[PDB]
Enzyme design. Sequence first.
Site, PDB file in Angstrom:
ATOM      1  N   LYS A 170       0.822  -1.190   0.000  1.00 51.85           N
ATOM      2  CA  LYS A 170       0.000   0.000   0.000  1.00 51.85           C
ATOM      3  C   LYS A 170       0.864   1.250   0.000  1.00 51.85           C
ATOM      4  O   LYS A 170       0.471   2.275  -0.543  1.00 51.85           O
ATOM      5  CB  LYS A 170      -0.901   0.003   1.217  1.00 51.85           C
ATOM      6  CG  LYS A 170      -1.870   1.142   1.227  1.00 51.85           C
ATOM      7  CD  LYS A 170      -2.556   1.232   2.571  1.00 51.85           C
ATOM      8  CE  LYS A 170      -3.737   2.195   2.528  1.00 51.85           C
ATOM      9  NZ  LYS A 170      -4.348   2.460   3.880  1.00 51.85           N
ATOM     10  N   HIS A 178       2.481   6.104  -2.604  1.00 50.73           N
ATOM     11  CA  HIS A 178       3.567   7.074  -2.639  1.00 50.73           C
ATOM     12  C   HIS A 178       4.681   6.956  -3.660  1.00 50.73           C
ATOM     13  O   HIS A 178       5.403   7.913  -3.871  1.00 50.73           O
ATOM     14  CB  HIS A 178       4.214   7.176  -1.228  1.00 50.73           C
ATOM     15  CG  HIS A 178       3.238   7.444  -0.109  1.00 50.73           C
ATOM     16  ND1 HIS A 178       2.642   8.673   0.081  1.00 50.73           N
ATOM     17  CD2 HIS A 178       2.735   6.630   0.850  1.00 50.73           C
ATOM     18  CE1 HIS A 178       1.804   8.598   1.100  1.00 50.73           C
ATOM     19  NE2 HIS A 178       1.839   7.375   1.588  1.00 50.73           N
ATOM     20  N   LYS A 238      -8.864  11.723  -0.593  1.00 48.02           N
ATOM     21  CA  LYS A 238      -7.771  11.760   0.428  1.00 48.02           C
ATOM     22  C   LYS A 238      -7.345  13.245   0.449  1.00 48.02           C
ATOM     23  O   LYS A 238      -6.999  13.790  -0.600  1.00 48.02           O
ATOM     24  CB  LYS A 238      -6.601  10.863   0.003  1.00 48.02           C
ATOM     25  CG  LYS A 238      -5.502  10.799   1.041  1.00 48.02           C
ATOM     26  CD  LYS A 238      -4.511   9.682   0.821  1.00 48.02           C
ATOM     27  CE  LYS A 238      -3.416   9.807   1.860  1.00 48.02           C
ATOM     28  NZ  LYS A 238      -2.386   8.771   1.708  1.00 48.02           N
ATOM     29  N   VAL A 281      -4.550  14.958   1.568  1.00 49.27           N
ATOM     30  CA  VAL A 281      -3.161  15.306   1.339  1.00 49.27           C
ATOM     31  C   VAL A 281      -2.472  14.013   0.951  1.00 49.27           C
ATOM     32  O   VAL A 281      -2.822  12.957   1.498  1.00 49.27           O
ATOM     33  CB  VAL A 281      -2.511  15.818   2.668  1.00 49.27           C
ATOM     34  CG1 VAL A 281      -1.024  16.008   2.497  1.00 49.27           C
ATOM     35  CG2 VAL A 281      -3.127  17.113   3.119  1.00 49.27           C
ATOM     36  N   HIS A 316       4.447   3.604   5.847  1.00 47.33           N
ATOM     37  CA  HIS A 316       3.724   4.846   6.098  1.00 47.33           C
ATOM     38  C   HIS A 316       4.617   6.048   5.796  1.00 47.33           C
ATOM     39  O   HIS A 316       5.802   6.023   6.089  1.00 47.33           O
ATOM     40  CB  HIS A 316       3.288   4.797   7.572  1.00 47.33           C
ATOM     41  CG  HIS A 316       2.969   6.123   8.201  1.00 47.33           C
ATOM     42  ND1 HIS A 316       1.701   6.673   8.156  1.00 47.33           N
ATOM     43  CD2 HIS A 316       3.704   6.927   8.982  1.00 47.33           C
ATOM     44  CE1 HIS A 316       1.682   7.768   8.889  1.00 47.33           C
ATOM     45  NE2 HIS A 316       2.878   7.955   9.407  1.00 47.33           N
ATOM     46  N   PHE A 317       4.061   7.055   5.122  1.00 49.77           N
ATOM     47  CA  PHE A 317       4.791   8.269   4.816  1.00 49.77           C
ATOM     48  C   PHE A 317       4.332   9.216   5.911  1.00 49.77           C
ATOM     49  O   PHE A 317       3.132   9.506   6.030  1.00 49.77           O
ATOM     50  CB  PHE A 317       4.406   8.824   3.438  1.00 49.77           C
ATOM     51  CG  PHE A 317       5.281   9.965   2.994  1.00 49.77           C
ATOM     52  CD1 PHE A 317       5.050  11.269   3.448  1.00 49.77           C
ATOM     53  CD2 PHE A 317       6.387   9.725   2.194  1.00 49.77           C
ATOM     54  CE1 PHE A 317       5.921  12.313   3.116  1.00 49.77           C
ATOM     55  CE2 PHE A 317       7.261  10.757   1.862  1.00 49.77           C
ATOM     56  CZ  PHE A 317       7.019  12.052   2.326  1.00 49.77           C
ATOM     57  N   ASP A 318       5.278   9.673   6.722  1.00 49.15           N
ATOM     58  CA  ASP A 318       4.984  10.532   7.864  1.00 49.15           C
ATOM     59  C   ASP A 318       5.028  12.036   7.616  1.00 49.15           C
ATOM     60  O   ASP A 318       4.119  12.750   8.036  1.00 49.15           O
ATOM     61  CB  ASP A 318       5.908  10.169   9.045  1.00 49.15           C
ATOM     62  CG  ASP A 318       5.326  10.570  10.390  1.00 49.15           C
ATOM     63  OD1 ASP A 318       4.164  10.230  10.671  1.00 49.15           O
ATOM     64  OD2 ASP A 318       6.000  11.246  11.179  1.00 49.15           O
TER      65      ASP A 318
END
Length: 124
Positions: free
Chosen positions: A7, A12, A41, A43, A119-121
């Site tokens: 995912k 990303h 979504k 952002v 996960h992109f933080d």
Amino acid sequence: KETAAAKFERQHMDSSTSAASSSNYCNQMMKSRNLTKDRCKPVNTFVHESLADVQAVCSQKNVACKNGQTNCYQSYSTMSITDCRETGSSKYPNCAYKTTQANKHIIVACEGNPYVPVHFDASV
């Protein structure tokens, strides 16, 4: 069943351009990656680098995540990224986005075996 690692790549990764080609980049990509399916979504960040280079950030600088967790890591180098954010007019299912080009350090949360981004933080 999509794994968290899979995912992250769908949401990303875009290793096919050096940067966003036009101001319509986000509108097109948000739609094609299935990110506007049941909601717009708000952002989303796309990264224009090789997957191996992005996976290696999990062995770089350890930093706290925005939610206090401690499995986040910051890139030593800046990366080409595209920031996609909803415009005032956006209204599901007619999602609309503003495309902004940038070269920043990225912060991702890693997990698993092998240890990969899930996960992109944030970006700094």
